[PDB]
A paper describes a structure:
In cardiac muscle, cardiac myosin comprises, in part, the thick filament of the cardiac sarcomere and powers cardiac contractility. The force produced by myosin motors is generated by coupling the sequential release of the products of ATP hydrolysis (Phosphate (Pi) and ADP) to a series of strong actin-binding states and the swing of a distal elongated domain of myosin called the lever arm. Omecamtiv mecarbil (OM) is a selective, small-molecule cardiac myosin activator that binds to the catalytic domain of myosin and increases cardiac contractility in preclinical models without affecting cardiac myocyte intracellular calcium concentrations or myocardial oxygen consumption. Here, we describe a previously unseen conformation of the bovine cardiac myosin motor in the PPS state that OM stabilizes and binds to with high affinity.
Comparison of the structures with and without drug bound reveals that the OM-binding pocket is actually not completely formed in the APO-MD-PPS structure. Interestingly, in the presence of OM, the lever arm adopts a primed lever arm position that is close to that previously observed for scallop myosin II, while the cardiac apo PPS structure has a lever arm position slightly less primed, with concerted changes in the relay and the converter position. Comparison of these two cardiac PPS structures reveals that drug binding does not significantly alter the structure of the motor domain. The two motor domains of OM-S1-PPS and APO-MD-PPS structures can be superimposed overall with a root-mean-square deviation (r.m.s.d.) of 0.88 Å for 557 Cα atoms between the OM bound and APO structures and with a r.m.s.d. of 1.33 Å for 593 Cα atoms if the relay and converter are also taken into consideration. Comparison with other myosin II isoforms in the same structural state reveals that the cardiac myosin PPS state is also very similar to that of Argopecten (scallop)-striated muscle myosin II (1QVI13, r.m.s.d. of 0.75 Å for 582 Cα atoms) and chicken smooth muscle myosin (SMM) II (1BR114, r.m.s.d. of 0.95 Å for 547 Cα atoms). Importantly, our structures indicate that OM does not change the conformations that the motor domain explores during the motor cycle but acts by increasing the stability of the states with lever arm primed.
Residue numbers in the entry: 10 to 200, 216 to 296, 299 to 568, 573 to 627, 644 to 718, 736 to 747, 750 to 775
Amino acid sequence: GEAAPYLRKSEKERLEAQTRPFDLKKDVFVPDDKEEFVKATILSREGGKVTAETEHGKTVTVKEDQVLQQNPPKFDKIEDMAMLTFLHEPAVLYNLKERYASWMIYTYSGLFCVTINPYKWLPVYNAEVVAAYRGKKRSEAPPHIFSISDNAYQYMLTDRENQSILITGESGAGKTVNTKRVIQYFAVIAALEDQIIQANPALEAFGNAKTVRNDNSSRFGKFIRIHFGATGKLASADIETYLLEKSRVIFQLKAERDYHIFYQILSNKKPEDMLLITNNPYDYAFISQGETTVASIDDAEELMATDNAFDVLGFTTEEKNSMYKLTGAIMHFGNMKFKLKQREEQAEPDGTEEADKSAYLMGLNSADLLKGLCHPRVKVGNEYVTKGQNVQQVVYAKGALAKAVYERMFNWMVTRINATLETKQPRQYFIGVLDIAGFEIFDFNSFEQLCINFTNEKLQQFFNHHMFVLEQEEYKKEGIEWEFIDFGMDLQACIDLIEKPMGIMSILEEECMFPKATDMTFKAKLFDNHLGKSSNFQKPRNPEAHFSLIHYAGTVDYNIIGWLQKNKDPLNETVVDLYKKSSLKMLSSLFANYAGFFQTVSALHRENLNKLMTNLRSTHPHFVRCIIPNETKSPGVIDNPLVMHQLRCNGVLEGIRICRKGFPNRILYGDFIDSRKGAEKLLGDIDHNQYKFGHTKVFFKAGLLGLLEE
Ligand SMILES: Nc1ncnc2c1ncn2[C@@H]1O[C@H](COP(=O)(O)OP(=O)(O)O)[C@@H](O)[C@H]1O
Ligand SMILES: [Mg+2]
């Protein structure tokens, strides 16, 4: 057989009808003062178009020049949108809807792939499918992330250059689950190295958690590069982490959860007591707020999934019991007294079981830590002063240790993981796979949310910078003297407002170095600098005292609390000095090592990202746009304003234009005197018209080289 008999591949891609209602019936998509349209039979035409509608009445002349019509049902449910005769928001949504209701999540849009989250597990990712997709053309194979990932792999071999697959989506849009299959494809294409497959579910327990927008929400940016040699066999794999929401460990909002790991460990009877663990909620204060479990997910069976990944990847039984002794101690640090010696402002713990956290966490003196937290030694100039803190500052310092201990342990995981995957025989060509923490909007948005929205903005900029601006620069002289066409999409203004002089980051860094500086001080400084000046900055009126920032994906209001403390994440030297001199070997490396763990958090993320974007530019990009159908995390429901504006901000429609208007195919006088003339040498039975050049020939349309190969 092949991909032609009606079984599994043909079953899960399109379906035939038996009634053909076609004829000369022409239609138009019409709304009702909102972005929600219905079909309408066109009744009359001259200067405008009289449309019947019949849905709640009839005739309405007002169509004219705007109009924007319905495409023949012949196109309805097509695979590539650059094929549609009429192109606009309703015409595009309907084709994506027609496919979705037939459980076809993938659709092509000019070049870049489009994926609408199903919120149900579709059987389209099988070994039988990976094999059915091995080395097959875009025209030869229907839309699928296995085709896009194959095309990238083929291009890194045919063009001999680095490739990068870039996935673009909001929180819960399918980025992680797509990234998961791109790596799943290559291990059973070019490749033991099963571990590459096991690295992601090991960074899922410690790295992913439950938000109101996603149950397995990636609380970190991930750059996974799959290494290849000369022939194209799997040489290695390198992973990089980004803005980890380490504040989630000490605090979670209503209905949310902490990292999966905490819930998984309490569920497993490994000490069967030694770690002094008990029940998931109640007892542990860093967990007992909102919820304990996620629907249709087993916290007992998930630690069986991660212990499997640790033992596969080379983590020994002692290393495991070390990592869990940390997790069990973060939970143990979570229950402190911090009462009062003198009822004014002197903190004092009235005998607690912190001698048990001190037991699990590398046998640190129980008499110490108590002193290292309550009374930590500072210095005024050259004088070693002893500070006697208050209940609030003791809580924040306790938290400082929890967040520090955790992030540093998570960063160690990646170092230990890469000292398995990356370490083999690396060099040559490679496939980069981006899985960034998607565009977030909540009731309370703090520092980490701004960090996220900056990453999402700059990644979206890279899509605008590559689809248009870069393409149009090449068209300048060589093309049809290129008009040129102008697209309203420009996210540099909102970027400049966040970073470069003058920007939010710079204004914030200046306040960390400043001693008198407080939260109330620098929100005033922000307003002083950006209100009534920048149009993409907004100062809430008499809402609150926070600040609003306009993005491609919409405006966000960010609350200022912590922020200065978040940016200059401080851990008292006494608590650092306390942990270096400890029993357990694992946390000894978490404080004694310097090569791996002053620089302000915002400047580090700014530069981590700078570094990331500079890698990508030296790579050939492949875009995947993840569209979320709804906000109730439910299958079968595709909402009109939710989807119709993800495409509006993603620049999906304009990305079909220039792919249609301009010249997507560029070449010289090779790969075909033997070859020099674009008109003369190619004139020898069909076409001979849709192209253009001046010098450094030729610039052809997408619908010419597709037939030249076929
Ligand atoms: N292609 C897909 N097939 C099946 N389920 C999917 C798919 N994409 C996403 N999901 C579901 O939606 C959830 C949210 O997607 P996810 O990849 O975790 O988010 P994000 O895009 O933010 O990284 C997943 O936990 C999974 O249940
Ligand atoms: Mg994710």
